[PDB]
Amino acid sequence: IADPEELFTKLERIGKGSFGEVFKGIDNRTQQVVAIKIIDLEEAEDEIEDIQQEITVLSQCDSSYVTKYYGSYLKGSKLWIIMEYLGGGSALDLLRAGPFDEFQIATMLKEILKGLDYLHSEKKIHRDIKAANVLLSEQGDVKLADFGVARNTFVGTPFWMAPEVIQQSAYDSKADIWSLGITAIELAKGEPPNSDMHPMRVLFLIPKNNPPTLVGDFTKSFKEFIDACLNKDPSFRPTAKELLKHKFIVKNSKKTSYLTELIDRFKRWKAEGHS
Ligand SMILES: N#CCC1C=CC(=Nc2nc(Nc3cc(C4CC4)[nH]n3)c3ccccc3n2)C=C1
């Protein structure tokens, strides 16, 4: 029990996520830039020791495709979670300057797929693949911010949810393949399919409707990639690994450093006047 208000300095706010706020921060002793997620567990003090149990296990993970956990510190009923800082922004931030071209998308999806194809020893992993959770380093490395293991009273956002997840079927890692498909549409178009519909309506249509498709004169191979992820039968969606060999990814992927151009493109958008 050392006080994190003294160990760390908050700089800018970077996230208005769910349980609280994420900050760009700095460790006062070592000067390492970090990400700090603060969550109030006032009435849920019993939850604390479990949350720190999980943070400690996560910090032993060896994936270079997830934002690493460094530890956590209790202050009052607030828990300060200390994580790796990535300075390039999320894909969703970068999308504000416009959708990405196919070579950028294939490059980004390949890095996501490498992280989905990673063997995790941790017990029951949950994932939330979407553009808000895809982070870029300043050098263009791609890491996901959704990674973890097993009183929240709201249903949630449906747009990236797989059919079998909604029909309440016991769901495996094929659900993340579906969500990756939706995220690919999000990167090409700017938003997930049916983003103009009421969420409760979307939640009912997902299991009943034919899968969404990419609208636009994109290459046939990109549309086939999307079609493969968005199979309605979990069993016939391909694995992360089969997808890493899809001709869309193989033909169009570039070195990850090329994604710095998206960072730069966001800078002139800002320089042009938030627009
Ligand atoms: N918790 C949680 C998920 C999450 C997902 C996205 C997110 N957005 C975001 N995150 C970051 N940076 C970040 C976030 C994290 C860590 C996930 C908390 N590590 N680095 C930046 C950095 C610079 C500009 C904009 C940024 N936006 C912040 C947090």
Numbering used by the authors: 17 to 166, 176 to 300
The authors write:
The four human MSTs are regulated differently by C-terminal regions flanking the catalytic domains. MST4 has been shown to phosphorylate the actin remodeler Ezrin at its regulatory residue T567 resulting in transmission of cell polarization signals.
Here we present the crystal structure of the unphosphorylated kinase domain of human MST4 refined at 2.35 Å resolution in complex with an ATP mimetic quinazoline inhibitor. The approximately 13 degrees swinging motion (when compared to the same helix in MST3) allows the A-loop to also swing towards the N-lobe, resulting in the conformation captured in the crystal of MST4. In addition to the two hydrogen bonds observed in the structure of MST3 in complex with staurosporine, the glutamic acid carbonyl (Glu100) is involved in a third hydrogen bond to the pyrazole group of the quinazoline inhibitor in MST4. Conversely the asymmetric unit of MST4 contains a symmetry-related dimer where the visible C-terminal section of the A-loop of the molecules is contacting each other. The combined observation of the dimer in the asymmetric unit and the A-loop conformation suggest that the kinase domain of MST4 can dimerize in a ‘face-to-face’ fashion. While the structure of MST4 supports the A-loop exchange autophosphorylation model, it probably represents an intermediate, pre-catalytic state.
